[PDB]
Amino acid sequence: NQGTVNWSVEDIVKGINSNNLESQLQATQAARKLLSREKQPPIDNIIRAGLIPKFVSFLGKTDCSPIQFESAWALTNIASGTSEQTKAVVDGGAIPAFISLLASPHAHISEQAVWALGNIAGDGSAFRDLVIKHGAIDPLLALLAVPDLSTLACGYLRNLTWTLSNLCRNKNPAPPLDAVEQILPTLVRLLHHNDPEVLADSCWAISYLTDGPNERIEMVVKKGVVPQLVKLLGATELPIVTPALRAIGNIVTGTDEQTQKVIDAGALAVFPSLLTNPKTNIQKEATWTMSNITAGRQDQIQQVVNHGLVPFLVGVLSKADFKTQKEAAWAITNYTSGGTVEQIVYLVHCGIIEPLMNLLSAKDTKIIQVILDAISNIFQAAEKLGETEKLSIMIEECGGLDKIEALQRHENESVYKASLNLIEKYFS
């Protein structure tokens, strides 16, 4: 193979322009190797030399499967570059040619075409939709139509899963409803596979599909994946937990009923671990997820209480990355706006007040507004119990009054309005 190593582009062009298929093959392989080096593959040089149309025509040479493979790989690597470089591959007519290769008798060639289409679809909504219009989905799914996924080569299965997840990936617009419905059954199946990378990408795909309007969430939830997601939520591999949690988080941005599916599946039992997870991002996303659950019904808030999660929210509020603490503030405001008086009182018994007040020192304006809303909802709860006096004292002897008073000097309009109000109304 050293005979095709380090060719100049002009030598590649010379070979590809010969009338000799073997010479063209050697030149295409030399191109693949150029495009396969680690540092600065000369993608722009190869494009500028006008090689793409030739590579595309080589995709069609059924009688020379080696030049199909070499050109497929060269084009994959071009398509992996910038949008402009992917566009050059698409403009050369590569999409239908790669789709035709999906059914190749040679596994390594089929797989190469899968990868290329994943790069093209991954560029954005429009190329994703163009790949779908050219009819990629049927042949892709047919490659996974086997009794047991384990009989497929591991690398081959991972590539197929990754490409399918790109077909589920972008928005503005989201994938066509019809394409999602066609893909979902195979996705649900991959989501039960034992390989961690297949599971990671399957979850990523489900998370993409559940990121949008509630109707999108519903067509996923209706397939019965929620229990499997919750299981994966407890995996040890961070690459699996992260997308599982993203999908669960998206699903609870939906209706009360969609949210109840997640609770019934047992998700809340995993949040003591997630809300203390060593990975900052897992904590953040877990707290975000909790904030949407506490925005639910009172019976849903009650299950958060029953699962002992309020002390975990007090914990995050007391100490966490600031973005996570802001999410915790939201979780508390949502809880306090939707909860019963008894649930709200309970919050106070768990120690929510002091950490809440300490966060009034944050420079961020939004979290300050959020916290003042929470404090108002709590005072409101204490008015119905005639214990506003006692609450006022709590807030006072932990530095709270100093915070709220200072917030009258605060720049933002909505802040001083809520602050001054709290003072005159509960602190005379």
Partner: peptide, 16 residues
């Protein structure tokens, strides 16, 4: 007040 989200696999991969 539900709030939509609005280490993932990469959108593109080169084969080396």
């Amino acid at each position: 007040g539900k709030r939509k989200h609005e280490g993932p696999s990469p959108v593109k991969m080169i084969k080396t």
